[PDB]
UniProtKB/Swiss-Prot annotation, chain E:
Domain of life (superkingdom): Viruses
Interval of the full protein contained in this chain: 854 to 950 of 1273
Primary role: Subunit of the fusion protein that is processed upon entry into the host cell. Mediates fusion of the virion and cellular membranes by functioning as a class I viral fusion protein. Contains a viral fusion peptide that is unmasked after S2 cleavage. This cleavage can occur at the cell membrane by host TMPRSS2 or during endocytosis by host CSTL. In either case, this triggers an extensive and irreversible conformational change that leads to fusion of the viral envelope with the cellular cytoplasmic membrane, releasing viral genomic RNA into the host cell cytoplasm.
Organism per entry: Severe acute respiratory syndrome coronavirus 2
Gene name per UniProt: S
Protein name per the record: Spike protein S2'
Effect of N3K: In strain: Omicron/BA.1
Length: 48, 414, 134, 48, 97, 48, 96
């Protein structure tokens, strides 16, 4: 899996989001962020 | 020193002008173009940093700009106006430039001629290259223009400045001539004359575009550029870049992965150079259209929604108004311009001295048959009797060069 | 002949060495998948747009039968709408027309309007109006 | 790989420089017309 | 020169460029604004000086009562171009770039 | 290396050519406004 | 509240404004540039697909477009005029 973990100033991970649960989760790893304004995005295909 | 040229007649002229607005909508996927359905190839591409997340993002950035360009050119108004059913415009005929309600499409009579005058030719979608549909389909593109004519023709130019205000079309051009230096008495005495000439002007441009004369020269270039560049990208995949084969599947069936590290990478490096050039060349082409798109957008706000006093910015000649029409990957402007006709050889003089006082023209020129003097508008010969109402008194008679003696009729106590 | 080429110089049609039957070869990956999503802090339910697939070959083109069950949820169902830009799944079609805020393509947009769901519709070009001309 | 890193950046920056350069000149054109005088052109210094 | 750098001549030679400027120079002087919008209309230049003042809100009478002063002053501004262009500090920076 | 040397020269030429187009169109618009007629735009044809 | 300014005289000044219209058209041929007078090197270039048949149209595309700039700026009149033999321009000396 491709995991995107975000770290606070301490380094302890408070939340994590897997990028294969749904095509919504595919957007975050595609864009490398979480809090993004409303719009439309394209994600590279990853189904095998 | 004392010869002036004042036109004695006039003719109406309708020209055309083509300007691209949006170009072909293209997008390239990251992995599909370089190597499709090969998980052993994408691993090697991952070690070359983040190129396709830049190139596709840049290519996607064109798509946002291309849809925004059409919105800032065509969606200038926020209400879809409709032309009234009664086509009584004071002798003018407007059927050729308005959409036909009988047809199931909103494209007007001349837009069908324009849409087949230039073409676009699609089937190579398999190797990554795809075409995104435009935000505004051709049915909606014609709908914007139909409202824009429904505002300029019927509501004057006020619909571009707020709520639409109704006005006759005979009214509209009557004091629109007031913006080019001629009074409004010209049209009311020549409404029949200008109507047939204007209708024939629409007929003259209709036959030329319906013939074999290629007048849409600029539109074909932008379509070919967005077609030749893609085709070069299609053909470029057939080159080996010095490899033992131009197809990676054979190389995957030829060399072991320890021996394919050198072989495949040089293919990967070569094809990245091929794609980088396309994305680069797409940006300048998108930059040039955007410069023309703002030019089209400015002409939308200037050459249509009002009267522009800038010389030779909307067609050729004095500006009266324009008829925007839908075109594939662009817009067509029909500038209706005022052109002076043949003139008469007049003899002029700057001023008149009557009783030692100088009378200067308030508005117009001073012309003579050769013995008698008359005053008329600068851009149209309508001679008038020299009165104290059309002139004003200033200065003496020994300070202005070229002054001529003449009499002034006084009408207040005849 | 043994195989056919094209502009791309790719083998698109090959002849069977056994039955000598003319047949065509083409892949359909449609790797450009797009999702329509509001602000990520607003909601989780979204709509996914598929480009030029007619959404009748989705289980066949990607072999979703043997995939994870979460892919088959959006592969088929009653929430299927077809556009000129493709087949849109995950939105409720509405017969009205508003000034849309989310561009998708082919005149179809999306919004966040009411029980909450994302609605897709043909955009409204503006408020219809007429001028009292005489 | 690093020269090609700079070749991508410099090309994009020059292209983006032209985007600002046309916009700045457009503002400058509006700067000499919309504020330093009264403008007669329609829908160039705002709606109406 | 070496290594495949070929310079094509311009489509319009430098001699013919000046004639278009000469044509525009005579067009601006003897016609003003008419020749750019259709048939050329001949008009005295003294008259054309007035009708541009009317385009900037200046009354017609200001030119005629001060015609002599403008004639000396307009040429002095023209004569100042040579002093502003023949100096060491050249003002032709944009073309030189 | 020579192709990359030639490629960056072509890219540099294309960027500069577009700026000449913007300048020429500004010159062309000036030619249609500053010379062939009278322009009421403030501070467009020189100062004043 | 009640102060306005009306000039009592005027000054006529001319200012020089500079704008480029076109530059020198350039063209590069890959046949002799990359591999100078060597037929054993051009065959390597032929294996690189079509770049140098793609760059030539780019430079020529510039040169064709730049020739349009010269005609777009200067060639906006359909007639060629000449000065009259007399030079009675109301006190203005235009011979410069
Ligand atoms: C004005 O016209 C008259 C009539 O021909 C002429 O004699 C005179 O010289 C002209 N004025 C000037 C300043 O040349
Ligand atoms: C989501 O973020 C936007 C940021 O603009 C904010 O306006 C909105 O109130 C936020 N909503 C929630 C539910 O956090
Ligand atoms: C999509 O499938 C339906 C079902 O057979 C068919 O009627 C329709 O024509 C298909 N769409 C296209 C574009 O062929
Ligand atoms: C929209 O209209 C069509 C035809 O009038 C109808 O078949 C469809 O059910 C309508 N949709 C809704 C949500 O009512
Ligand atoms: C301006 O101010 C003066 C005194 O301060 C006052 O008399 C006058 O009425 C004012 N004018 C206006 C227009 O306010």
């Amino acid at each position: 899996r491709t995991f995107l973990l975000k770290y606070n100033e301490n380094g302890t991970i408070t939340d994590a989001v897997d990028c294969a649960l749904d095509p919504l989760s595919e957007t975050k790893c595609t864009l490398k962020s979480f809090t993004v304004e409303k719009g439309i995005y394209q994600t590279s295909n990853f189904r095998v | 020193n004392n010869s002036i040229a004042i036109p004695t007649n006039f003719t109406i002229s309708v020209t055309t002008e083509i300007l691209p607005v949006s170009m072909t909508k293209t997008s390239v996927d990251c992995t599909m173009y370089i190597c499709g359905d090969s998980t052993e190839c994408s691993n090697l591409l991952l070690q070359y940093g983040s190129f396709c997340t830049q190139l596709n993002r840049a290519l996607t950035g064109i798509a946002v700009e291309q849809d925004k360009n059409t919105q800032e050119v065509f969606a200038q108004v926020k209400q879809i106006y409709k032309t009234p059913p009664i086509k009584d415009f004071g002798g003018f005929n407007f059927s050729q430039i308005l959409p036909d309600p009988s047809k199931p499409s909103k494209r007007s009579f001349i837009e069908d001629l324009l849409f087949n005058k230039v073409t676009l030719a699609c089937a190579q979608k398999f190797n990554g290259l795809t075409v995104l549909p435009p935000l505004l389909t051709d049915e909606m593109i014609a709908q914007y223009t139909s409202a824009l004519l429904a505002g300029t023709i019927t509501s004057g130019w006020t619909f571009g400045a707020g709520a639409a205000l109704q006005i006759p079309f005979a009214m509209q051009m009557a004091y629109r001539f007031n913006g080019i230096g001629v009074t409004q008495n010209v049209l009311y005495e020549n409404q029949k004359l200008i109507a047939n000439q204007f209708n024939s002007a629409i007929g003259k441009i209709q036959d030329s575009l319906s013939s074999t004369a290629s007048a849409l020269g600029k539109l074909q270039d932008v379509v070919n550029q967005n077609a030749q560049a893609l085709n070069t990208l299609v053909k470029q995949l057939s080159s080996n870049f010095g490899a033992i084969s131009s197809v990676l599947n054979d190389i995957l069936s030829r060399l072991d992965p320890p021996e394919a590290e050198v072989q495949i990478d040089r293919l990967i490096t070569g094809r990245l150079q091929s794609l980088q050039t396309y994305v680069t060349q797409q940006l300048i082409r998108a930059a040039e259209i955007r410069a023309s798109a703002n030019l089209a957008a400015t002409k939308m706000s200037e050459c249509v929604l009002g009267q522009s006093k800038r010389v030779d910015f909307c067609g050729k000649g004095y500006h009266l108004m324009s008829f925007p029409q839908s075109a594939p990957h662009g817009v067509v402007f029909l500038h209706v311009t005022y052109v002076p006709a043949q003139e008469k050889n007049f003899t002029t003089a700057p001023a008149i001295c009557h009783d030692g006082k100088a009378h200067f023209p308030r508005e117009g020129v001073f012309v003579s048959n050769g013995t008698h003097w008359f005053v008329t508008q600068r851009n149209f010969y309508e001679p008038q009797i020299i009165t104290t109402d059309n002139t004003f008194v200033s200065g003496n008679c020994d300070v202005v060069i070229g002054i001529v003696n003449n009499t002034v009729y006084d009408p207040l106590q005849p | 002949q043994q195989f056919g080429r094209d502009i791309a110089d790719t083998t698109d049609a090959v002849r069977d060495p056994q039955t000598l039957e003319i047949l065509d070869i083409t892949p359909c990956s449609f790797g450009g998948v797009s999702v329509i999503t509001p602000g990520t802090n607003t909601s989780n339910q979204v709509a996914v747009l598929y480009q030029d697939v007619n959404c009748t070959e989705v289980p066949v083109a990607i072999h979703a039968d043997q995939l994870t069950p979460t892919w088959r949820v959006y592969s088929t169902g009653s929430n299927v709408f077809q556009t000129r830009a493709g087949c849109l799944i995950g939105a409720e079609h509405v017969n009205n027309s508003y000034e849309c805020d989310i561009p998708i393509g082919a005149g179809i947009c999306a919004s966040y309007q009411t029980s909450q769901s994302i609605i897709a519709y043909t955009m409204s070009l503006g408020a219809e109006n007429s001028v009292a001309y005489s």
